[PDB]
Curated annotation (Swiss-Prot):
Residues 349-409 form the SH3 domain. Coiled coil: none annotated. Guanyl-nucleotide exchange factor of the RHOG GTPase stimulating the exchange of RHOG-associated GDP for GTP. May play a role in chemotactic cell migration by mediating the activation of RAC1 by EPHA2. May also activate CDC42. Residues 242-347 form the PH domain. One of its GO terms (cellular component) is cytoplasm. This is Rho guanine nucleotide exchange factor 16. One of its GO terms (biological process) is activation of GTPase activity. The keyword Phosphoprotein applies. It comes from the Eukaryota. GO terms for molecular function: guanyl-nucleotide exchange factor activity; PDZ domain binding; receptor tyrosine kinase binding; small GTPase binding. The PDZ-binding motif mediates interaction with TAX1BP3. It is found in: Cytoplasm. Residues 16-222 are annotated as: Required for RHOG activation and mediates interaction with EPHA2.
């Protein structure tokens, strides 16, 4: 609750009477990094004490399941503590802290490596929790009882496990504000900038690691599931191929006008960044490929209108070297837009800006996870869904428009745009 200005030691010193307002802000900026860091470190300790070190929870899982669930949280927690400790000594030593940029850069360059591993392991962590919740009875019971305990603060385990990822994404914002407020001293500003570059570099490494691990898992898992026996074999595995969107769609026939809303034939699409694969789902883990085509040679178009939201996918060069047209429909206007936006994947400042109001977690390959106060540029709006590019890292995704509110005041708008340029890769 207390701010640096309200801090008892700062009052007794009475440095307030003679101190530039910008410096008061630099000290509040440094104080925010330390105060935010402690709350996270405390939240990490709850995760370690109530969940990681729960013998009963370990008893419900296997030696291997525990590693995926919790990962190197002990290593990540240890990294956070040493960092807070360095910052704290500076805070205790003097009423007005000279610099913390040296600690910011040093830790990001040499001691923040655990975050990259922890962030990259998210794909496994998520699937491990889901498998445990859906099919492990013993797990569900024990976790609820731990969640009921007062220390968790009636926060669920998942929200603790996502905290390291959230902090590292916000570290550049806190360091940025410092750079803005360190402009007054020339020598310090350069060091503060050194920090943002190192801090922003670390986020890039964590973001890339998450993508490499997640796409590598998807390409191997999908490679087994897609059965290319009937058609000309296509090598799916590649270190470059990733999944744009997957989904079931309704097959449309022009032969019959009188369609039904029951027992409608369907097809399942896997759309990769460079290839579209048309399959028909046999099991939950087998899909029989019917055709495929390079995204260079795929056209998409809305169909003139029941079975609403129809669209036509044209394979100009198909698996057999020929041309084929697929007529599909979806029962969601927003869903059709997401398929067209993906299928046209190959194809500034006047971009409407929105600010996240409620944390949103991505449920699909299209979507982009967003936490509160994240800014997102808006690219397309359809049926209550916004296709947008995250201001912090440039990642683009869909999310419901209900989680954000329009920012119209230019002074804010152009501030975020000028601010995004500073952290732009």
């Amino acid at each position: 609750q207390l701010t640096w200005s309200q801090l008892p030691e700062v009052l007794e010193s009475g440095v307030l009477d003679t101190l530039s307002t910008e410096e008061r802000k630099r000290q509040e900026a440094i104080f925010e990094i330390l105060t935010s860091e402690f709350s996270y470190l405390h939240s990490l300790s709850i995760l370690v004490t109530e969940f990681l070190q729960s013998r009963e929870l370990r008893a419900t899982m296997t030696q291997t399941e525990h590693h995926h669930l919790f990962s190197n949280i002990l290593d990540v927690m240890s990294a956070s503590q040493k960092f807070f400790e360095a910052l704290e000594q500076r805070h205790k030593a003097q009423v007005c802290v000279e610099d913390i940029s040296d600690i910011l850069e040093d830790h990001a360059q040499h001691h923040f490596h655990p975050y990259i591993a922890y962030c990259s392991n998210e794909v496994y962590q998520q699937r491990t929790l889901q498998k445990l919740s859906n099919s492990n009875a013993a797990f569900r019971d024990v976790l609820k009882e731990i969640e009921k305990r007062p220390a968790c603060g009636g926060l669920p385990m998942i929200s603790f496990l996502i905290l390291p990822m959230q902090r590292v994404t916000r570290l550049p914002l806190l360091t940025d504000t410092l750079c803005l407020k360190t402009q007054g001293h020339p020598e310090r500003y350069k060091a503060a900038s050194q920090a943002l570059k190192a801090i922003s570099k670390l986020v890039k490494q964590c973001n890339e690691g998450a993508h490499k691990m997640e796409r590598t898992e998807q390409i191997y898992t999908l490679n087994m599931q897609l059965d290319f026996g009937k058609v000309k074999s296509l090598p799916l595995i590649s270190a470059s191929r990733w999944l744009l969107k997957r989904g079931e769609l309704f097959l449309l026939e022009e032969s019959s006008i009188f369609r039904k809303i029951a027992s409608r034939p369907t097809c399942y699409l896997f759309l990769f960044n460079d290839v579209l694969v048309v399959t028909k789902k046999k099991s939950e883990e087998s899909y029989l490929v019917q055709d495929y085509a390079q995204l260079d040679h795929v056209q998409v178009r809305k169909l003139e209108p029941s079975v609403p939201y129809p669209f036509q996918v044209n394979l100009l060069h198909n698996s057999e070297g020929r041309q084929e047209q697929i007529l599909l429909s979806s029962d969601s206007a927003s869903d059709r837009a997401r398929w067209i936006t993906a299928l046209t994947y190959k194809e500034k400042g006047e971009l409407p800006q929105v600010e996240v109001t409620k944390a949103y977690f991505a449920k699909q390959a299209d979507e982009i996870t967003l936490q509160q106060a994240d800014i997102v540029l808006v690219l397309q709006e359809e049926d209550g869904w916004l296709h947008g590019e995250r201001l912090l890292d440039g990642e683009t995704g869909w999310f419901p428009e209900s989680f954000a509110h329009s920012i119209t005041s230019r002074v804010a708008v152009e501030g975020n745009v000028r601010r995004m340029e500073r952290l732009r890769v």
